[PDB]
Amino acid sequence: NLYFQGIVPRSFRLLDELERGQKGVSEGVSFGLESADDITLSNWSCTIFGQPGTVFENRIYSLTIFCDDNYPDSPPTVKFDTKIEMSCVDNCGRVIKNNLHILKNWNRNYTIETILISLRQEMLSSANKRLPQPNEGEVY
């Protein structure tokens, strides 16, 4: 059994986040592997609960996070499978890196969870919270 202070290899890092996710995490996000047999641990199935008091209220959004082999030093790619209108989401549901702080100014100390949390907070902003939405459960 290994010990060291400091940064851990990609595989160790993703094992930590997986254990975190599998233990059901912060409010109300969930995350895990798209498929249990992926040994690169690169593709993640995620859920965001809509923010109470907004056009997102009571909706469930499904999304996919992909961590390439430079992860955690490089940001993952983020896309919504569930249709959403947000200033940091493009026409195909993918997150516009330069419109979300944590992706734009990524830091290896952010996580899959940070992204999910950040997306739920974006729903509270004034550019988003009154934005007219697609029909509920509609996908790309």
JSON list of C-alpha atoms in Angstrom, two decimals:
[
{"chain": "A", "resi": 1, "resn": "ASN", "atom": "CA", "xyz": [0.00, 0.00, 0.00]},
{"chain": "A", "resi": 2, "resn": "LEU", "atom": "CA", "xyz": [1.36, 3.31, -1.34]},
{"chain": "A", "resi": 3, "resn": "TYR", "atom": "CA", "xyz": [1.80, 6.65, 0.44]},
{"chain": "A", "resi": 4, "resn": "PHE", "atom": "CA", "xyz": [2.72, 10.04, -0.87]},
{"chain": "A", "resi": 5, "resn": "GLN", "atom": "CA", "xyz": [1.70, 13.65, -0.25]},
{"chain": "A", "resi": 6, "resn": "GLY", "atom": "CA", "xyz": [0.83, 15.53, -3.42]},
{"chain": "A", "resi": 7, "resn": "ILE", "atom": "CA", "xyz": [-0.56, 14.92, -6.88]},
{"chain": "A", "resi": 8, "resn": "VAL", "atom": "CA", "xyz": [-1.57, 11.36, -7.80]},
{"chain": "A", "resi": 9, "resn": "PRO", "atom": "CA", "xyz": [-1.57, 9.73, -11.25]},
{"chain": "A", "resi": 10, "resn": "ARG", "atom": "CA", "xyz": [-4.63, 10.12, -13.55]},
{"chain": "A", "resi": 11, "resn": "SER", "atom": "CA", "xyz": [-5.80, 6.62, -12.74]},
{"chain": "A", "resi": 12, "resn": "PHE", "atom": "CA", "xyz": [-5.62, 7.17, -8.94]},
{"chain": "A", "resi": 13, "resn": "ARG", "atom": "CA", "xyz": [-7.36, 10.52, -9.28]},
{"chain": "A", "resi": 14, "resn": "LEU", "atom": "CA", "xyz": [-10.28, 9.02, -11.29]},
{"chain": "A", "resi": 15, "resn": "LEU", "atom": "CA", "xyz": [-10.56, 6.13, -8.86]},
{"chain": "A", "resi": 16, "resn": "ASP", "atom": "CA", "xyz": [-10.98, 8.72, -6.02]},
{"chain": "A", "resi": 17, "resn": "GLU", "atom": "CA", "xyz": [-13.74, 10.57, -7.93]},
{"chain": "A", "resi": 18, "resn": "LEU", "atom": "CA", "xyz": [-15.42, 7.27, -8.82]},
{"chain": "A", "resi": 19, "resn": "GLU", "atom": "CA", "xyz": [-15.59, 6.18, -5.16]},
{"chain": "A", "resi": 20, "resn": "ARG", "atom": "CA", "xyz": [-16.94, 9.63, -4.34]},
{"chain": "A", "resi": 21, "resn": "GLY", "atom": "CA", "xyz": [-19.63, 9.39, -7.04]},
{"chain": "A", "resi": 22, "resn": "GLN", "atom": "CA", "xyz": [-20.63, 5.77, -6.22]},
{"chain": "A", "resi": 23, "resn": "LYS", "atom": "CA", "xyz": [-21.26, 6.81, -2.69]},
{"chain": "A", "resi": 24, "resn": "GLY", "atom": "CA", "xyz": [-24.40, 8.71, -3.73]},
{"chain": "A", "resi": 25, "resn": "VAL", "atom": "CA", "xyz": [-22.47, 13.55, -3.45]},
{"chain": "A", "resi": 26, "resn": "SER", "atom": "CA", "xyz": [-23.27, 17.24, -3.12]},
{"chain": "A", "resi": 27, "resn": "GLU", "atom": "CA", "xyz": [-26.80, 18.52, -3.77]},
{"chain": "A", "resi": 28, "resn": "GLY", "atom": "CA", "xyz": [-28.34, 17.59, -6.26]},
{"chain": "A", "resi": 29, "resn": "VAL", "atom": "CA", "xyz": [-25.76, 16.21, -8.62]},
{"chain": "A", "resi": 30, "resn": "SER", "atom": "CA", "xyz": [-24.77, 12.68, -9.34]},
{"chain": "A", "resi": 31, "resn": "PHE", "atom": "CA", "xyz": [-21.95, 11.22, -11.43]},
{"chain": "A", "resi": 32, "resn": "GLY", "atom": "CA", "xyz": [-20.49, 7.88, -12.43]},
{"chain": "A", "resi": 33, "resn": "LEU", "atom": "CA", "xyz": [-19.07, 5.78, -15.22]},
{"chain": "A", "resi": 34, "resn": "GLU", "atom": "CA", "xyz": [-21.04, 5.52, -18.45]},
{"chain": "A", "resi": 35, "resn": "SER", "atom": "CA", "xyz": [-20.15, 1.80, -18.37]},
{"chain": "A", "resi": 36, "resn": "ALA", "atom": "CA", "xyz": [-18.68, -0.20, -15.49]},
{"chain": "A", "resi": 37, "resn": "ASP", "atom": "CA", "xyz": [-16.15, -1.98, -17.77]},
{"chain": "A", "resi": 38, "resn": "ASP", "atom": "CA", "xyz": [-14.29, 1.18, -19.03]},
{"chain": "A", "resi": 39, "resn": "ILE", "atom": "CA", "xyz": [-10.78, 0.72, -17.66]},
{"chain": "A", "resi": 40, "resn": "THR", "atom": "CA", "xyz": [-9.60, 4.15, -18.80]},
{"chain": "A", "resi": 41, "resn": "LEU", "atom": "CA", "xyz": [-12.39, 5.71, -16.60]},
{"chain": "A", "resi": 42, "resn": "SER", "atom": "CA", "xyz": [-12.77, 8.46, -19.18]},
{"chain": "A", "resi": 43, "resn": "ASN", "atom": "CA", "xyz": [-16.53, 8.72, -19.87]},
{"chain": "A", "resi": 44, "resn": "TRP", "atom": "CA", "xyz": [-18.97, 9.76, -17.14]},
{"chain": "A", "resi": 45, "resn": "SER", "atom": "CA", "xyz": [-22.73, 9.73, -16.94]},
{"chain": "A", "resi": 46, "resn": "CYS", "atom": "CA", "xyz": [-23.93, 12.69, -14.82]},
{"chain": "A", "resi": 47, "resn": "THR", "atom": "CA", "xyz": [-27.17, 14.18, -13.49]},
{"chain": "A", "resi": 48, "resn": "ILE", "atom": "CA", "xyz": [-28.00, 17.77, -12.50]},
{"chain": "A", "resi": 49, "resn": "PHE", "atom": "CA", "xyz": [-31.21, 18.66, -10.64]},
{"chain": "A", "resi": 50, "resn": "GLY", "atom": "CA", "xyz": [-32.63, 22.00, -11.82]},
{"chain": "A", "resi": 51, "resn": "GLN", "atom": "CA", "xyz": [-32.38, 24.93, -9.47]},
{"chain": "A", "resi": 52, "resn": "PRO", "atom": "CA", "xyz": [-35.53, 25.75, -7.36]},
{"chain": "A", "resi": 53, "resn": "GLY", "atom": "CA", "xyz": [-37.10, 29.09, -8.32]},
{"chain": "A", "resi": 54, "resn": "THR", "atom": "CA", "xyz": [-35.91, 29.16, -11.92]},
{"chain": "A", "resi": 55, "resn": "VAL", "atom": "CA", "xyz": [-37.06, 28.02, -15.35]},
{"chain": "A", "resi": 56, "resn": "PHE", "atom": "CA", "xyz": [-35.03, 24.84, -14.53]},
{"chain": "A", "resi": 57, "resn": "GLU", "atom": "CA", "xyz": [-37.09, 24.08, -11.41]},
{"chain": "A", "resi": 58, "resn": "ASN", "atom": "CA", "xyz": [-37.93, 20.37, -10.98]},
{"chain": "A", "resi": 59, "resn": "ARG", "atom": "CA", "xyz": [-36.17, 19.21, -14.11]},
{"chain": "A", "resi": 60, "resn": "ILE", "atom": "CA", "xyz": [-33.50, 16.53, -14.40]},
{"chain": "A", "resi": 61, "resn": "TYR", "atom": "CA", "xyz": [-30.66, 17.11, -16.84]},
{"chain": "A", "resi": 62, "resn": "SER", "atom": "CA", "xyz": [-28.53, 14.26, -18.14]},
{"chain": "A", "resi": 63, "resn": "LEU", "atom": "CA", "xyz": [-24.98, 14.91, -19.24]},
{"chain": "A", "resi": 64, "resn": "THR", "atom": "CA", "xyz": [-21.76, 13.27, -20.33]},
{"chain": "A", "resi": 65, "resn": "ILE", "atom": "CA", "xyz": [-18.27, 14.24, -19.11]},
{"chain": "A", "resi": 66, "resn": "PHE", "atom": "CA", "xyz": [-15.26, 12.94, -20.98]},
{"chain": "A", "resi": 67, "resn": "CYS", "atom": "CA", "xyz": [-11.83, 12.99, -19.32]},
{"chain": "A", "resi": 68, "resn": "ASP", "atom": "CA", "xyz": [-8.98, 12.63, -21.88]},
{"chain": "A", "resi": 69, "resn": "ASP", "atom": "CA", "xyz": [-5.54, 11.20, -21.01]},
{"chain": "A", "resi": 70, "resn": "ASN", "atom": "CA", "xyz": [-4.22, 14.65, -19.88]},
{"chain": "A", "resi": 71, "resn": "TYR", "atom": "CA", "xyz": [-6.92, 14.77, -17.15]},
{"chain": "A", "resi": 72, "resn": "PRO", "atom": "CA", "xyz": [-6.82, 16.32, -14.44]},
{"chain": "A", "resi": 73, "resn": "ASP", "atom": "CA", "xyz": [-4.34, 18.81, -15.91]},
{"chain": "A", "resi": 74, "resn": "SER", "atom": "CA", "xyz": [-6.68, 19.56, -18.82]},
{"chain": "A", "resi": 75, "resn": "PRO", "atom": "CA", "xyz": [-10.44, 20.22, -18.51]},
{"chain": "A", "resi": 76, "resn": "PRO", "atom": "CA", "xyz": [-12.85, 17.46, -19.47]},
{"chain": "A", "resi": 77, "resn": "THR", "atom": "CA", "xyz": [-15.35, 18.02, -22.30]},
{"chain": "A", "resi": 78, "resn": "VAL", "atom": "CA", "xyz": [-18.88, 18.57, -21.07]},
{"chain": "A", "resi": 79, "resn": "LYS", "atom": "CA", "xyz": [-22.12, 18.05, -22.97]},
{"chain": "A", "resi": 80, "resn": "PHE", "atom": "CA", "xyz": [-25.78, 17.95, -22.13]},
{"chain": "A", "resi": 81, "resn": "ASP", "atom": "CA", "xyz": [-27.75, 15.02, -23.46]},
{"chain": "A", "resi": 82, "resn": "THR", "atom": "CA", "xyz": [-30.91, 16.74, -22.07]},
{"chain": "A", "resi": 83, "resn": "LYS", "atom": "CA", "xyz": [-31.85, 19.92, -23.90]},
{"chain": "A", "resi": 84, "resn": "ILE", "atom": "CA", "xyz": [-31.13, 23.14, -22.10]},
{"chain": "A", "resi": 85, "resn": "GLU", "atom": "CA", "xyz": [-30.86, 26.87, -22.81]},
{"chain": "A", "resi": 86, "resn": "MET", "atom": "CA", "xyz": [-27.99, 28.43, -20.91]},
{"chain": "A", "resi": 87, "resn": "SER", "atom": "CA", "xyz": [-25.51, 31.13, -21.91]},
{"chain": "A", "resi": 88, "resn": "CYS", "atom": "CA", "xyz": [-22.60, 28.61, -21.51]},
{"chain": "A", "resi": 89, "resn": "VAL", "atom": "CA", "xyz": [-24.29, 25.81, -23.53]},
{"chain": "A", "resi": 90, "resn": "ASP", "atom": "CA", "xyz": [-24.03, 25.77, -27.36]},
{"chain": "A", "resi": 91, "resn": "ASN", "atom": "CA", "xyz": [-26.70, 24.75, -29.93]},
{"chain": "A", "resi": 92, "resn": "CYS", "atom": "CA", "xyz": [-25.72, 21.06, -29.61]},
{"chain": "A", "resi": 93, "resn": "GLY", "atom": "CA", "xyz": [-25.64, 21.05, -25.80]},
{"chain": "A", "resi": 94, "resn": "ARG", "atom": "CA", "xyz": [-21.94, 21.29, -25.36]},
{"chain": "A", "resi": 95, "resn": "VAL", "atom": "CA", "xyz": [-20.45, 23.53, -22.73]},
{"chain": "A", "resi": 96, "resn": "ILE", "atom": "CA", "xyz": [-18.73, 26.60, -24.11]},
{"chain": "A", "resi": 97, "resn": "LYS", "atom": "CA", "xyz": [-15.45, 26.54, -22.19]},
{"chain": "A", "resi": 98, "resn": "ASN", "atom": "CA", "xyz": [-14.93, 30.32, -22.33]},
{"chain": "A", "resi": 99, "resn": "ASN", "atom": "CA", "xyz": [-18.37, 31.03, -20.86]},
{"chain": "A", "resi": 100, "resn": "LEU", "atom": "CA", "xyz": [-17.80, 29.03, -17.65]},
{"chain": "A", "resi": 101, "resn": "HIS", "atom": "CA", "xyz": [-15.02, 30.16, -15.22]},
{"chain": "A", "resi": 102, "resn": "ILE", "atom": "CA", "xyz": [-13.86, 26.78, -14.01]},
{"chain": "A", "resi": 103, "resn": "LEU", "atom": "CA", "xyz": [-13.42, 25.46, -17.58]},
{"chain": "A", "resi": 104, "resn": "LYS", "atom": "CA", "xyz": [-11.96, 28.66, -19.01]},
{"chain": "A", "resi": 105, "resn": "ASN", "atom": "CA", "xyz": [-9.50, 29.06, -16.15]},
{"chain": "A", "resi": 106, "resn": "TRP", "atom": "CA", "xyz": [-9.29, 25.37, -15.39]},
{"chain": "A", "resi": 107, "resn": "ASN", "atom": "CA", "xyz": [-7.10, 24.29, -12.44]},
{"chain": "A", "resi": 108, "resn": "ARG", "atom": "CA", "xyz": [-6.22, 20.60, -11.80]},
{"chain": "A", "resi": 109, "resn": "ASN", "atom": "CA", "xyz": [-7.81, 20.96, -8.34]},
{"chain": "A", "resi": 110, "resn": "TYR", "atom": "CA", "xyz": [-11.32, 21.16, -9.88]},
{"chain": "A", "resi": 111, "resn": "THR", "atom": "CA", "xyz": [-13.26, 17.88, -10.33]},
{"chain": "A", "resi": 112, "resn": "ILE", "atom": "CA", "xyz": [-16.15, 16.40, -12.23]},
{"chain": "A", "resi": 113, "resn": "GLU", "atom": "CA", "xyz": [-18.14, 17.50, -9.16]},
{"chain": "A", "resi": 114, "resn": "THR", "atom": "CA", "xyz": [-16.89, 21.14, -9.44]},
{"chain": "A", "resi": 115, "resn": "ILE", "atom": "CA", "xyz": [-18.24, 21.21, -13.00]},
{"chain": "A", "resi": 116, "resn": "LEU", "atom": "CA", "xyz": [-21.62, 19.80, -11.99]},
{"chain": "A", "resi": 117, "resn": "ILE", "atom": "CA", "xyz": [-21.83, 22.29, -9.08]},
{"chain": "A", "resi": 118, "resn": "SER", "atom": "CA", "xyz": [-20.79, 25.13, -11.38]},
{"chain": "A", "resi": 119, "resn": "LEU", "atom": "CA", "xyz": [-23.49, 24.25, -13.87]},
{"chain": "A", "resi": 120, "resn": "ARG", "atom": "CA", "xyz": [-26.15, 24.18, -11.20]},
{"chain": "A", "resi": 121, "resn": "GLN", "atom": "CA", "xyz": [-24.99, 27.64, -10.01]},
{"chain": "A", "resi": 122, "resn": "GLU", "atom": "CA", "xyz": [-25.11, 29.03, -13.51]},
{"chain": "A", "resi": 123, "resn": "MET", "atom": "CA", "xyz": [-28.86, 28.28, -13.47]},
{"chain": "A", "resi": 124, "resn": "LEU", "atom": "CA", "xyz": [-29.23, 30.90, -10.71]},
{"chain": "A", "resi": 125, "resn": "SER", "atom": "CA", "xyz": [-27.72, 33.69, -12.78]},
{"chain": "A", "resi": 126, "resn": "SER", "atom": "CA", "xyz": [-29.84, 36.46, -14.32]},
{"chain": "A", "resi": 127, "resn": "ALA", "atom": "CA", "xyz": [-28.72, 35.68, -17.87]},
{"chain": "A", "resi": 128, "resn": "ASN", "atom": "CA", "xyz": [-30.18, 32.14, -17.37]},
{"chain": "A", "resi": 129, "resn": "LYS", "atom": "CA", "xyz": [-32.87, 31.87, -14.66]},
{"chain": "A", "resi": 130, "resn": "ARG", "atom": "CA", "xyz": [-35.70, 33.46, -16.72]},
{"chain": "A", "resi": 131, "resn": "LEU", "atom": "CA", "xyz": [-34.58, 32.00, -20.04]},
{"chain": "A", "resi": 132, "resn": "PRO", "atom": "CA", "xyz": [-37.35, 30.16, -22.02]},
{"chain": "A", "resi": 133, "resn": "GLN", "atom": "CA", "xyz": [-36.60, 26.40, -22.01]},
{"chain": "A", "resi": 134, "resn": "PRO", "atom": "CA", "xyz": [-37.11, 23.45, -24.40]},
{"chain": "A", "resi": 135, "resn": "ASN", "atom": "CA", "xyz": [-39.87, 20.96, -23.43]},
{"chain": "A", "resi": 136, "resn": "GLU", "atom": "CA", "xyz": [-38.99, 18.82, -20.40]},
{"chain": "A", "resi": 137, "resn": "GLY", "atom": "CA", "xyz": [-37.11, 15.57, -21.08]},
{"chain": "A", "resi": 138, "resn": "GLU", "atom": "CA", "xyz": [-36.39, 16.55, -24.69]},
{"chain": "A", "resi": 139, "resn": "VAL", "atom": "CA", "xyz": [-32.92, 15.40, -25.85]},
{"chain": "A", "resi": 140, "resn": "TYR", "atom": "CA", "xyz": [-30.45, 16.32, -28.62]}
]
